[PDB]
C-alpha cells in the first residue's frame, strides 16, 4: 500500500511551529506536520523533506530562488512537491531544489509537470487521486534530492513513478 501509517520515528508538530529557524528558513528534524489542506510531511534527521502523504487530492520569491542551498544547481528551480493548485505551500515546507527539466514543460521531458498534468486530467474527469505517497531520496548531506518516488491510486488502481532529479 501507499496509505499514511503513523510512525514513532517522527514527532508531530502544530502547523506553524515546524520551522527550526526563520532566518534563514529551515525545517525541524525528524518531525511530521499537517498543512491546513491536509497534506502530511515528514522530515529526516537533517530537516530535509523525506515523505509526503495526500489522502485525497483535490483542486484548490526568495524560497523558490534559494531552496537547496549550496547544493542547488544552475538549472534547478524551487520546485513544489505538491503544486499550488492542489493546495500546496509556496514556502520551504513544500519546496525542494528540482531540475527545471522535470519541473517545467519540456518536450520529451518535464516529468514532474507531466505527473501534475495527469493528476489534473484525472480530477477534472471526475476520477479520484488517492493515497499519494512521495518519497524524496537524498545523497550524503546534500539538500538536493537525487530521485523522487511517487505512489498513488486512481480509482483504486495503484501507480508507481520513479523520477530522477535531472
Ligand atoms: Mg512545479
Author numbering: 444 to 503, 509 to 614
Can you provide the manuscript's text about this entry?
EsaD is a toxin secreted in a T7SS machinery-dependent manner by S. aureus. The major contribution of this study is the discovery of an inhibitory mechanism in the toxin-antitoxin module that is based on a significant structural deformation of the toxin, where the central β-sheet of the nuclease domain of EsaD is split by EsaG into two fragments.
The structure contains a central 6-stranded β-sheet that is largely open to solvent on one side and flanked by one short α-helix (αA) and the well-known ββα-metal finger motif on the other side. The ββα-metal finger (Residues 501–573), playing a critical role in nicking DNA, creates a compact catalytic center that is composed of two antiparallel β-strands (β4 and β5) connected by a long loop and linked to a C-terminal α-helix (αB). As observed in some other His-Me finger nucleases, αB is interrupted by a protruding ‘finger loop’ of unknown function. In addition, a long N-terminal loop (Residues 455–468) wraps around the central β-sheet from the β1 side and extends to the “back” face. Notice that the EsaG binding surface of the CFL part of the free EsaDc is exposed to the solvent, while that of the NFL part is buried and stabilized by the ββα-metal finger motif. There are two tryptophan residues in EsaDc (W560 and W567), both of which are buried in the free EsaDc structure, but exposed to solvent on the structure of the complex.
